[PDB]
């Protein structure tokens, strides 16, 4: 499944840009830096064209997907573009039905235990913890008891100083966005090889 690919690369690049050409540059730098899970948010104008213009990286071994999906009609353009996973900052049940029928992996946004239960009843066991800068790694370690099946991929508050705290708490991967986006198309590649190293060094 996509879960085994999340468990291997352990890092997802939440890419947010302003233009179409700006997004293709940062995705090339992130992939050259060792990160293979790239999340192209739909706040970028014409994000459905960036995903289909990065289709050559799927031959090089990259997993390009669509993130920050608010409406299901946005997920229509996301699936038709060629995205391999759909990511939303909130739990939208109608998007889960469309992704299940079309056969696309969907990771909803969850912040509370009740939002997790409602997402579990939809069949999801891999949830996005947004914003991680508010719940913290203590949240992941707290849900390990009552919900031993849920696997979190946080997005907020995941920096190099505490990237091992998330993993030693029990997360499946981490979604770094601000740190990887900031920088020139050559600083972005360097920021990736430094972040991949710290993740590999965590106990």
């Amino acid at each position: 499944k996509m879960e085994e690919l999340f468990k291997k690369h352990k890092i997802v690049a939440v890419l947010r840009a302003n233009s179409v050409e700006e997004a293709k540059e940062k995705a090339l730098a992130v992939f050259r830096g060792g990160v293979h899970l790239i999340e192209i948010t739909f706040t970028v104008p014409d994000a459905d064209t960036v995903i289909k213009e990065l289709s050559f990286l799927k031959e090089k071994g990259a997993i390009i997907g669509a993130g920050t999906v608010t409406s299901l009609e946005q997920c229509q353009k996301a699936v038709e573009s060629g995205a391999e996973f759909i990511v939303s900052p909130h739990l939208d049940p109608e998007i889960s039905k469309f992704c299940k029928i079309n056969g696309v992996f969907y990771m909803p946004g969850v912040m509370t235990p009740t939002e997790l239960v409602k997402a579990m009843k939809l069949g999801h066991t891999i949830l996005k913890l947004f914003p991680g800068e508010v719940v913290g790694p203590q949240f992941v370690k707290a849900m390990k008891g009552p919900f031993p099946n849920v696997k979190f991929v946080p997005t907020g508050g995941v920096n190099d100083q505490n990237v091992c705290e998330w993993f030693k708490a029990g997360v499946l991967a981490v979604g770094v966005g601000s740190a990887l986006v900031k920088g020139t198309p050559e600083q972005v590649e360097m920021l990736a090889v430094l972040f991949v190293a710290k993740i590999a060094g965590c106990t």
Binding site: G34, D160, M190, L194, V196, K198, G201
Partner: protein
């Protein structure tokens, strides 16, 4: 005879007769152009002979043979940093860490190259990586 000349260059390298050792490695290269050990040793001998421009060429020929030597990439970072290509050396130290994220020396030397190159934030993140390793 391809291996014997490599052992000859190692012995000459033990007596500080480095220029004579470089001739021994070059003879093994002519016997077998694919001996990666002869190329890697020749680069480390020319590095101390301060033929840094020729030293980096032998290190590249060694990496071309065995492209997963964290020792060869890290040694190519030393030559390119002393030669003047600080941005090409940082890209070499990057490939060394891609192969071994536990190399405390490659992470420390990358932070020094980036600190002289400009990005203190990219250098500081590299400095903390090396400190946490050791």
């Amino acid at each position: 005879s391809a291996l014997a000349y490599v052992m000859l260059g190692l012995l000459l390298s033990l007596l500080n007769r480095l220029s004579l050792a470089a001739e021994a490695y070059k003879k093994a290269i002519e016997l077998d152009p694919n001996d990666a050990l002869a190329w890697l040793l020749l680069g480390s001998v020319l590095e101390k002979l301060k033929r840094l421009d020729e030293a980096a060429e032998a290190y590249k020929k060694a990496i071309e043979l065995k492209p997963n030597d964290a020792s060869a990439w890290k040694e190519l970072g030393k030559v390119l940093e002393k030669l003047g290509r600080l941005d090409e050396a940082a890209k070499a130290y990057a490939e060394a860490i891609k192969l071994d994220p536990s190399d405390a020396e490659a992470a420390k030397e990358l932070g020094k190259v980036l600190e002289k190159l400009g990005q203190l934030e990219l250098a500081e993140r590299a400095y903390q990586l090396a400190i946490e390793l050791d």
